Amino acid sequence: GVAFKELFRFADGLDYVLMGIGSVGAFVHGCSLPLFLRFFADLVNSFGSNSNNVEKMMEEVLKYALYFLVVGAAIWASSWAEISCWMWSGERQTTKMRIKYLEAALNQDIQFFDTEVRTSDVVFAINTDAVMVQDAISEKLGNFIHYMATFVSGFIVGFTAVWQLALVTLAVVPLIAVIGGIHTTTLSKLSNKSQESLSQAGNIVEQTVVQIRVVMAFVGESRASQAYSSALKIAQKLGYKTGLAKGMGLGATYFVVFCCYALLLWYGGYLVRHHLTNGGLAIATMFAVMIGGLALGQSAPSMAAFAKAKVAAAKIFRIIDHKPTIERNSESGVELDSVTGLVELKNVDFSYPSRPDVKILNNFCLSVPAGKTIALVGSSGSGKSTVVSLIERFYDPNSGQVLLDGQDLKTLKLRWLRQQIGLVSQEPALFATSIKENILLGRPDADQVEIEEAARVANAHSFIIKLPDGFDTQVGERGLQLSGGQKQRIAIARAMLKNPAILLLDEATSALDSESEKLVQEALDRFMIGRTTLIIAHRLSTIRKADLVAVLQQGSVSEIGTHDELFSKGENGVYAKLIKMQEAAHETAMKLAFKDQANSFWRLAKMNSPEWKYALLGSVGSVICGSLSAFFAYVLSAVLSVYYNPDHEYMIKQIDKYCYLLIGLSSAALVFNTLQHSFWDIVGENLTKRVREKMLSAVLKNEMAWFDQEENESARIAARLALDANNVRSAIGDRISVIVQNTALMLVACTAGFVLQWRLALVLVAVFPVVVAATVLQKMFMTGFSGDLEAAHAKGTQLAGEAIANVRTVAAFNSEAKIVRLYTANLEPPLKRCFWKGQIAGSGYGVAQFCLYASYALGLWYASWLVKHGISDFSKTIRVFMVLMVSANGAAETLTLAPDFIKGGQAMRSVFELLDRKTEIEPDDPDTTPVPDRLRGEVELKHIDFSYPSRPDIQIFRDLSLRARAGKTLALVGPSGCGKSSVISLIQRFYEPSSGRVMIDGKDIRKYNLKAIRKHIAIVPQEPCLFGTTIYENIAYGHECATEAEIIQAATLASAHKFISALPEGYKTYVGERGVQLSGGQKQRIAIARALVRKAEIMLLDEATSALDAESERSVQEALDQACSGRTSIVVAHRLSTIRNAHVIAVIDDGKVAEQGSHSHLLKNHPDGIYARMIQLQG
């Protein structure tokens, strides 16, 4: 870290007033409970000692009952000024911190984002590094003066009332403070392994849904519901050891608390007998020391957060004051009257300042004629990506000069130079703002007329009107994700608005289809006229339109000519041979109601009924654990009553008895606290395992189209099965154990209260809920109010994360201050809410603490009123008060019930909607026609019409009639694919045809059950798909009982035995993300070998393109030959040599098949057709 006192470097006039008030109001609040104890110790004394004079009893109890109404008013006005003046004086600082961080973070030169700090590291420093700082100066500095003043004032009132009893308590506190620290560390040692064991076993569902296409293609989907259950037991046996360590950490805290009070009370009963101590002063000292002695554990997080908030604050202050390395505010920058578009480059040598050894630019000399179309054509890595940055002057040249009308770049003003240059990037840059503000970045002062003119030139105003909101259409989280062509058109319109004289087209349409580029190119051509423009094209059509073509080679200009001059030198030149890898880059890449939320509880708690022997031995340990929080507060008051008896002989006999219950029935709290938390952790841990695999057995049952709804992504079913299944643990088992535990407490408190005096046990019950409601707020104060810091600043941070990441586009235009202005204005709406939240949470806590102490001035006065009128006395009216008022601080365990308590039916609806989801394709359909033995295997199709269910508009198949012969070959080929593969999907019944018939040996496939017809199809996916397990169990994923010889045969036939046996481990070699990575030409081999383990009659060899190894294919072709040896093979390929041995070759284009036959039959009727003309396109 940097230092303390450096975090408060953004303070202003109000930040020395809010901290100067929230430090006095938090110090007065801290020293108010150890003073209420002092007042209580004096009220009781003048309430039992003056039994012979009721008259003095009444003016000396009313006074101390009116002091309570002042102690409770000094907390209403002292908790308001602490909770509200600390959450606001941190919000006023951590906002000016973030504004400065962003303003000085995109001011840095682009070298900074590569040489020193990654572009993804900075976005982290706003998400978390600006939250760790705020939480350690707003809410955790105020919880430090409070818990230090409480500790300081916990000894002044203790050692000055009865010092001889305040030392025994000091000799006791460091025992509770050690047991309660060991228990909270043993729990953390076990709460960090369950997550590991649930995320190592929770990746099975992550992997399964990604490759559901091959998981469902084979029947091995029952191998994913038992490799997912046998990996949950690891997190279940470990989930049983958390309950035991939670019960033996609460049965040992009470075993110490009872014993220590079994000695403090005896010593207090010894002091009183010898006349050194009052009756109440021996009680408000044990409490006052233990309150001020345990007030250091709550001061541990406050100092633990002061260390993280400096190692997380040094990074921000590093960037904030770091001066850049280029003189941006260039007052020493020359100016030019009017440019003519003349650019010269002479002897420019440059290298990246990340590996200063390459020579990307060597002895570069190039002249840019004014008003002409100079195009850059070359291979990857031969330049055309550094010269564009150098004219923009992103990196200053290492050695060399660039002349723009005869003056050096290091001599003009940077902001003016970047004003006359128009840059169009290959990705459009849009920020979280409206369409209108996304174009004003070009120039601020433009009116609406010019913007609309530019938009209608940009082929943009056509769909602007079609958009509902028009120019105010908010692009960002909303905005329906407009198309890439439209995205490019907005940026192009922004470029026209700037109206530059020099234009840099760097890969304008390098990643769009021919439809959008058709619209874009003509607009660029209209915007081309009258401008010195340098185009880096990707298609030869624009190069044909280019005036000059200067081809770089190894960073130097090699070939200079035109479109026609360069092509005249034949294939021997680079210009003609560039077509081969130019045109190949296109085809290859292409709400409650008590009836809906009652079934959710009740249907859930019916399948959780094989375990009633464990939910019935947890309602006993919850009753004799709630009957001991009332047999302790009752003894703690029955000792106070006997302190005032004038007969010392009788007083000892009762102190002895009550010191033998707190020692005796302490083992009954040690034992019965390991039956409540150790038997409610078996009921609540087997329900989750049963509900986490009922969903998987249903997610593995939906239709193939259900996974293409764009809501069922890869890691979002895995998130629903891991975040909506951990909230069911706290719904049944963890809430019956709190209702019963607290029902068994108010039945032992209100019995011992009603037996003695029923006129006081009725009044105290009437104001009983306002005591527990006030005490719960005393435990939701330690964690802190206004949590969840990062989600409040989640709308503005999108602008930061999309603006600093696209720093090049931000700095190309001079919009480095017009984004700070947009980022400041999106932080005030949270700043007008975090203040009212602080006021509300301050007032609602102040009033709920005044109304608590106002209820201690109504019981203690009514007792004194009863005593005068001869109804009761001090003995009976002080047990009723103390029992009923301490079994409300002992009744505040409703805070400690894994306090979720509200996700409830909100999370429970998703679980039961997934279970109750129907499937229109039955995976295993009973009452079905029977499946024969080894069949003929003759696939036939009849008038097939088909389209994707997601897009039912484009009918791809239109009366598709095709028949696979009796096991010979049905090679399907054709150009313009992406839809040819639908025959593969139709046969495995992934999708349902719109209209048609699928005959297998002359029979419809809907009459067959789905899980047996798949015992005869062998699928080979195009993309190498091997699961994260060793080689042995990837090949074995195609059968049931695979012997060693069978797998060895499968490996040998696919030519995989040699390589696998050549590996170090052998068949046991581990493959996957966390292991060995192999070559794709071999990963296809393993897939083919897996295919020949089924011994199927129908083989669906999908395309194996995007891989070339002639020696590998020399064996792969014959491996396919015996893979096609008398078996019905429908092969879809791209290379015509692979279909030379095909018996039936079908050409499928424009949705129909017309050219069918073999090599001899097709070349006879179609000697000049597509099948014959595609041939010559390329020992």
Ligand SMILES: CC(C)[C@H](C)[C@@H](O)[C@H](O)[C@@H](C)[C@H]1CC[C@H]2[C@@H]3COC(=O)[C@H]4C[C@H](O)[C@H](O)C[C@]4(C)[C@H]3CC[C@]12C
């Ligand atoms: C009814 C009132 C007159 C009475 C003073 C009462 O309000 C009082 O504030 C009660 C609720 C508190 C004050 C101090 C508390 C105790 C604080 O000191 C203790 O010994 C701790 C130790 C341990 O952490 C126990 O879990 C709670 C336990 C044992 C608390 C039990 C409840 C109290 C005794």
